[PDB]
Design an enzyme around this catalytic site. Structure first.
Site, PDB file in Angstrom:
ATOM      1  N   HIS A 128      26.800   5.521 -32.254  1.00 28.91           N
ATOM      2  CA  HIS A 128      27.286   5.873 -31.054  1.00 28.91           C
ATOM      3  C   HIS A 128      27.047   7.486 -30.914  1.00 28.91           C
ATOM      4  O   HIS A 128      27.170   7.909 -29.749  1.00 28.91           O
ATOM      5  CB  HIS A 128      28.818   5.638 -30.914  1.00 28.91           C
ATOM      6  CG  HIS A 128      29.710   6.427 -31.891  1.00 28.91           C
ATOM      7  ND1 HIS A 128      30.198   5.922 -33.104  1.00 28.91           N
ATOM      8  CD2 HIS A 128      30.306   7.588 -31.959  1.00 28.91           C
ATOM      9  CE1 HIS A 128      31.011   6.732 -33.803  1.00 28.91           C
ATOM     10  NE2 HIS A 128      31.203   7.576 -33.009  1.00 28.91           N
ATOM     11  N   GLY A 145      34.876  14.326 -34.256  1.00 28.66           N
ATOM     12  CA  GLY A 145      34.081  15.124 -34.971  1.00 28.66           C
ATOM     13  C   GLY A 145      33.957  14.760 -36.346  1.00 28.66           C
ATOM     14  O   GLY A 145      33.106  15.341 -36.919  1.00 28.66           O
ATOM     15  N   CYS A 190      33.210  11.331 -37.241  1.00 29.22           N
ATOM     16  CA  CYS A 190      32.514  10.007 -37.656  1.00 29.22           C
ATOM     17  C   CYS A 190      31.397  10.501 -38.539  1.00 29.22           C
ATOM     18  O   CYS A 190      30.621  11.764 -38.519  1.00 29.22           O
ATOM     19  CB  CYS A 190      31.874   9.213 -36.288  1.00 29.22           C
ATOM     20  SG  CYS A 190      33.455   8.356 -35.670  1.00 29.22           S
TER      21      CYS A 190
END
Lengths: 300, 300
Positions: free
Chosen positions: B41, B142, B144
């Site tokens: 993502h 912040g 992931c």
């Protein structure tokens, strides 16, 4: 979201851990520069009984120390007590010595334990110093000399070295200058921990963390003034709040005043009524305002 | 004595963490060899709405990736999806790549999270995989691409990469092959976690830890057979015990049979009556037999 008790990463500390043995005693040392720092009871003939540390130093021999890291064996060229620690000058400088400082933590402050087992770093977890100078960790035989540290503004501070467990299970250690936190002696004899005084600042931070997490069931249409809370704290084994400065950001972001949370403490200390806050069943004083802001907002 | 949820030391993993940004998205990657692995993502134009990952890959440009570690900037020369991850070939080999393997954890198994904040390792803590493939951590924007790992017999395994949070606060990630634990999609849309099934093996380990710690108030003159416990578990959202082999040492050292502790589970699941076990107010399934043996006896 979520709140977990964390540790700061341990990599910078791991290369400093050595095995220190003397006789049949085995523990850990901190190898920095050309020094190894360890608990002085490694040289005691019988740690199960009261120790005369004068007699143990009188009969020490430098050659009898066995200090190792992997395939590196370190010879001791000088030995001193510094408080409850030995400071051992060795014949090699640790090439992985990090830039570092020393400081002492205070009650209510958090720090990290690198739990080491007969010279091998085994695990890392966060702790918070209790009012009587103790921590609630998990230490067994072979873990003395395990190191506590904290990183602040990119600076590594060494703050704790592990020595003993009290009869109630609380854990006791020293700063790296060999001053025992809480004043306890490095002896196996019974020593009492007085009454534990909860950190009100940290409980306030915990309730803010719950509010940031969207858990608000415990707040009511009530609020307690600072002097009023402090008079209550003094007879209920909680610390007095000296300043609200640490909560400015938390109050601004959540919209809840410190005084609302002070009322929550007084009410919830009587019991949670079978409910939980952040999965806890009673008030938690293990998290500082700084810890909550860092893990929940990712700032400073 | 004591029981704490620990993490294995993070040093071997820290040098592999990089910042990966694309557009306005910022997360973490795992730089091993000449590859960076991160959640896919990062390339999505709008992670607040359902994502068509075909469309995002169609419009990707390799030059638009910004990958860095300190003063090292890495250029992307190839990009593939592998499940829910991107695998990015970069123009430099990580000189600090550790020997490593990949594996998947299973429900009930513990592992370590290195929580990373926009490329910077920030903290390390232990987790346990829940029945529905989730963990209960502390992750924010912040974080992931934060990495889960476990050391077994001196071998480093990478086991988890962080992707998302469910509406109930549970945390979801993938293995390093890009298979999402629990089967969840890497989408912001509502996804339910089914019913949490407690790990009976881990609750038994927790009660053994209490007994090792000298806390025995909850044991009675009663004991429940294995088939009997399993019939109860199947209707009370606990796992069935398939084997008692994991408890042989714990039972031998404490002197308490598994069946005594199975009776304790059934009784205590109704409530602790305002008491605690190892400071917990309800049963805990976060610790494996291995974890308890390691921190309480210092063996394997």
């Amino acid at each position: 979201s979520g709140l977990r008790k964390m540790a700061q990463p341990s990599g910078i500390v791991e290369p400093c851990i050595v095995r220190v043995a003397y006789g049949s005693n085995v523990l850990n040392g901190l190898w920095i520069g050309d020094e190894v720092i360890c608990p002085r009871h490694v040289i005691a003939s019988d740690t199960s009984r009261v120790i005369n540390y004068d007699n143990e130093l009188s009969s020490v021999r430098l050659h009898n120390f066995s200090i190792a890291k992997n395939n590196v064996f370190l010879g001791v060229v000088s030995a001193k007590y510094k408080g409850v620690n030995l400071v051992l000058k060795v014949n090699q400088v640790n090439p992985n010595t990090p830039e570092h400082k020393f400081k002492s933590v205070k009650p209510g402050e958090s720090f990290n334990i690198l739990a080491c087992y007969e010279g091998c770093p085994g695990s890392v977890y966060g702790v918070n110093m209790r009012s009587q100078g103790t921590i609630k960790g998990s230490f067994i035989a072979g873990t003395c000399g395990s190191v506590g540290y904290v990183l602040e503004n990119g600076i590594l501070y060494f703050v704790y070295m592990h020595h003993l467990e009290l009869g109630n299970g609380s854990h006791v250690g020293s700063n790296l200058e060999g001053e025992m936190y809480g004043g306890y002696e490095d002896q196996p004899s019974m020593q009492l921990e007085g009454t534990n005084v909860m950190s009100s600042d940290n409980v306030v931070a915990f309730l803010y963390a719950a509010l940031i997490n969207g858990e608000r069931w415990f707040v009511t249409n009530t609020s307690m003034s600072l002097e009023s809370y402090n008079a209550w704290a003094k007879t209920n084994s909680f610390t007095e709040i000296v300043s609200t400065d640490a909560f400015n950001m938390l109050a601004a972001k959540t919209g809840y005043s410190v005084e609302k949370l002070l009322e929550c403490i007084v009410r919830l200390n009587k019991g949670f009524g079978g409910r939980t806050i952040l999965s806890y069943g009673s008030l938690c004083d293990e998290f500082t305002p700084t810890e909550v802001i860092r893990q929940m907002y990712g700032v400073n």
